[PDB]
Amino acid sequence: VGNVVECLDYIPGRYLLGYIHKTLGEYFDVSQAIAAGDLIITNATIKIDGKAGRATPFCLFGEKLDGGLGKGKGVYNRFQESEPDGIQ
RNA sequence: ACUGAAACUGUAGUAGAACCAAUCGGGGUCGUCAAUA
């Protein structure tokens, strides 16, 4: 956007494609696999619990003053929980 | 169903102005000393 580039907080799988070509392209036709769907390289997301971190579900809601996942409390799964009495 | 490329946080700017390390002072001159028996 003009003279600034904003950055993602994950690595998209397309950036690893050139590495997939370089390392494995001699063992199979990588381009053919891509076209056929025989290859998936996922996004690289932050490692949590020793595994790929999973994008925070939008069905989670924080108590606006005192809650949310950053505050570690007052997090409601609105797929399963009614909105509390008097708390936005 | 495929990483954009390429681009010097540089350019100009005197840590300086002001402030006496100074003020006063004849290299001079006279009475004892000591405490017992």
Side-chain angles (χ1 to χ4, degrees):
Chain A
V1 175
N3 69 333
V4 54
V5 180
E6 305 186 39
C7 186
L8 297 173
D9 60 9
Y10 69 94
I11 299 105
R14 85 178 182 268
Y15 293 75
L16 294 175
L17 287 176
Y19 152 86
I20 295 300
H21 284 284
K22 186 163 67 173
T23 58
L24 309 183
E26 62 186 298
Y27 302 132
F28 67 103
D29 188 341
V30 170
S31 296
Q32 183 181 24
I34 289 165
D38 306 349
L39 193 150
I40 293 94
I41 175 56
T42 73
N43 302 340
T45 56
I46 183 163
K47 197 171 186 174
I48 311 172
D49 308 325
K51 308 200 78 71
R54 302 176 295 159
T56 304
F58 293 167
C59 63
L60 302 183
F61 281 67
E63 302 184 4
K64 194 171 289 189
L65 300 183
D66 200 49
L69 284 166
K71 295 194 176 192
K73 67 184 64 76
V75 176
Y76 299 93
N77 180 20
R78 293 302 314 296
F79 283 7
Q80 309 300 342
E81 303 185 85
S82 319
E83 190 175 322
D85 298 344
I87 295 158
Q88 75 285 11

